[PDB]
Amino acid sequence: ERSVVHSTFIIERLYPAPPSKVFFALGNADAKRRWFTDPDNPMPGRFEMDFRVGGKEVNAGGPKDGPIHVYTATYQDIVPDQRIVYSYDMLFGETRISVSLATIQLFAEGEGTRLVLTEQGAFLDGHDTPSTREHGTGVLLDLLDAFLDKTTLEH
Amino acid sequence: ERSVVHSTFIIERLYPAPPSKVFFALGNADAKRRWFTDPDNPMPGRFEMDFRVGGKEVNAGGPKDGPIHVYTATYQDIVPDQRIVYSYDMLFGETRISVSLATIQLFAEGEGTRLVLTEQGAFLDGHDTPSTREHGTGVLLDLLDAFLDKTTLEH
Secondary structure, eight states: OOOEEEEEEEEEEESSSHHHHHHHHHHHHHHHHSSSOOOOOOGGGGEEEEEEOOOEEEEEOOOOOSSOOOEEEEEEEETTTTEEEEEEEEEEEEEEEEEEEEHHHHHETTTTEEEEEEEEEEETTTSSSSHHHHHHHHHHHHHHHHHHHHHTOOO | OOOEEEEEEEEEEESSSSSSHHHHHHHHHHHHHHSSTTTTTTOGOOOOOSSSSTOEEEEOOOOOOOOEEEEEEEEEEEEETTTEEEEEEEETEEEEOOOOOOEEEEEEEEEEEEEEEEEEEEEEEEEHHHHHHHHHHHHHHHHHHHHHHHOOOOO
16 A cells, blocks of 8 residues: 655754864765764675765665665755755665655854754655654764764874 | 756646556656647657656657757656656756756645655756746646646546
């Protein structure tokens, strides 16, 4: 039985690093590979990113026991140090769970950054929910926070 | 100066034709070429559609005098006779105006179809607005209505 649930959520986070540093963490493949992962089952060997409009990004994670969760994004708009728009789908095993349009905007906030992430999602056939996705995206932004803190301490 | 306006709108239309016929009008390249056009400046010579997940659709229109408006969609999910999910961007000349995630769902309504079109849009840098887009999408669904009426009369 077919259905779609549509939802939009917004998450705002403040980071002490300035927008250029936050943008680098999101737009540099080597950097993003180091943090954008499933902590419980990291698969950076599967991570690829072509950070350009029309470029693809792929990541994998999910339960140790499976099924494999595969994230596939396509960049739609990029403004250096300011904006990233990308569509992405999620597959759990062979099944498509959702398609979403995501926007990241970076604003100066003091000497740091106010990041605003908006996700406009289409959740397919009851396979995932807006609440669960919002929870997961919050967890990913927590990973970004930890990465920015740890990267700032580097020589 | 950079900004994004996010908005979701839903348009529902009732058509006397059953879902299979409505789906054909949306999913068959020859058929869609005959109706999905700018009436004031038709460019079906520019229309192409690869109706499959990952496939591209391109159309062009806009003012006779320019700038050229270019619609580019990518299919994200297709369920025969039931659902079409696609992302699309709009360019007026060389400038990207918006990126959207669109969902079409087809339900039986009597012997015909209840079509539900949801568009989740990201409007960039004030270059277009939710209200204008909703108006335009309504006009396109009016073109679909006329096509279905005219196609039903064919031998």
